[PDB]
From a paper:
Replication of the ∼30 kb-long coronavirus genome is mediated by a complex of non-structural proteins (NSP), in which [name] and [name] play a critical role in regulating the RNA-dependent RNA polymerase ([name]) activity of NSP12. The central unit of the replication machinery is NSP12, which is responsible for the RNA-dependent RNA polymerase ([name]) activity. In addition, [name] and [name], with molecular weights of ∼9 and ∼22 kDa, respectively, serve to promote the replication processivity of NSP12 (5,6). We report the crystal structure of the complex between [name] and [name] of [name]-[name]-2, revealing a 2:2 heterotetrameric form.
Next, we crystalized the [name]–[name] complex and solved the crystal structure at 2.7 Å resolution. The crystal structure of the [name]-[name] complex belongs to the space group P21, with each asymmetric unit containing two [name] and [name] molecules. Despite the fact that full-length [name] and [name] proteins were prepared for crystallization, we were only able to trace the electron density for the C-terminal domain of [name] spanning from residues E77 to S193, with the N-terminal portion most likely proteolytically cleaved during crystallization. On the other hand, we were able to trace the entire [name] molecule except for residues L83-Q84 at its C-terminus. Analysis of the structure of the [name]–[name] complex reveals a 2:2 [name]–[name] tetrameric complex, formed by two closely-packed [name]–[name] dimers. As previously observed for the [name]–[name]–NSP12 complex, [name] is comprised of an N-terminal domain, albeit with only two α-helices traceable here, followed by a C-terminal domain formed by a four-stranded antiparallel β-sheet packed against three intervening helices. [name] is comprised of four α-helices, with the last one moving apart from the first three to cradle the two N-terminal helices of [name], resulting in a mixed six-helix bundle. Furthermore, helix α1 of [name] and helices α1–α2 of [name] pack against the counterparts of the other [name]–[name] complex to form the tetrameric structure. Close inspection of the two interfaces revealed that both the dimeric and heterotetrameric association between [name] and [name] is dominated by non-polar contacts, involving all the four helices of [name] and helices α1 and α2 of [name].
Residue numbers in the entry:
A (entry chain D): 77 to 193
B (entry chain B): 77 to 192
C (entry chain C): 1 to 81
D (entry chain A): 1 to 79
The structure:
Amino acid sequence: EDKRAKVTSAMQTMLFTMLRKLDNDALNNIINNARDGCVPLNIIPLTTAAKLMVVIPDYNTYKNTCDGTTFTYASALWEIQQVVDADSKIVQLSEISMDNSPNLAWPLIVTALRANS
Amino acid sequence: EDKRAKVTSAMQTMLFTMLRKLDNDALNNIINNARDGCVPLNIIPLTTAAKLMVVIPDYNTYKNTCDGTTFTYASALWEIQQVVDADSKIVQLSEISMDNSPNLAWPLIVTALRAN
Amino acid sequence: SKMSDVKCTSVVLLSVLQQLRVESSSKLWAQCVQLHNDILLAKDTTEAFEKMVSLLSVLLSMQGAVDINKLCEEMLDNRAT
Amino acid sequence: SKMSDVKCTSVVLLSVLQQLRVESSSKLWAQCVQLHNDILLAKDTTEAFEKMVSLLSVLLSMQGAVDINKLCEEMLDNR
């Protein structure tokens, strides 16, 4: 399983070059978010009020994407329904503050519903 | 009416856009030849002196690709070895001339070997 | 146009997912196939890109199936190969 | 460059061949797979384009697998 992996490496490199060439704002967001550790747990849906789960790795990333109950991702707005920490405990939106950020068990998992696009 | 047949058509149209956008001399020739009915019967070989089989549909197409014993195709040179006519009977190269061409059973098939 | 580039990219992406042995998951693969076909059959770029967001999200949701940092490191080190 | 484009087209081309049920032919498919892998692993544009000529010829050698004029017809009409 050596040549196969070189072929696989080559296919993925060509894949992302096409993605880079596409220069789409929504595609760039999910690719760039994943590089920062903000990755989806399920397929990003397209129906209004459809469930999305994403890993959010740190507070700097959280502040860049979430404002109040609104999550911005893939050029769409998502209303956050649940936040859990690495212990699967519910984090109330009030505790996710700049002042309280070191007391949380990062990374967090956000469960949001699709709403504006 | 099948979604699958529609997908295949959609996939193939995009394929030629990539092929057409490449604007490759070697690729352009084999695609344009096929448009004129000059189509390969086997995989075009990559080694020196490996056999190539191609359909030649008419005399105007023959003259554009064949000079003496040289068949020009895929941006490479090929030495013609044999010509069979539409009835599988061998046709000697001296017979494939402008004056003798209607008397031949088109299409003819050239089996050539890569000179490069 | 750019319509073509998104459909072309989706065939590669499904093929990338092919190599990653996704077909074992007969629902994910069926879901991947449905998304890929919808992109090829799409009539405006909005559908191609929206469906592509979802289809690409499949690769991104696969922990360690790709190492995006590892891959992006390669592009910058290649710098036009 | 042009080379990235040629590798991408080969993945599309092999996939197109798969949709054409070429897989039932083990020996043709192996040739198609080996060429596709060589194109993705290619060192320079000459080898990539030479191998792409070979791989594409698989598609052109298949009578009716493509009706190049009918395909080229929806190309020109749709543009």
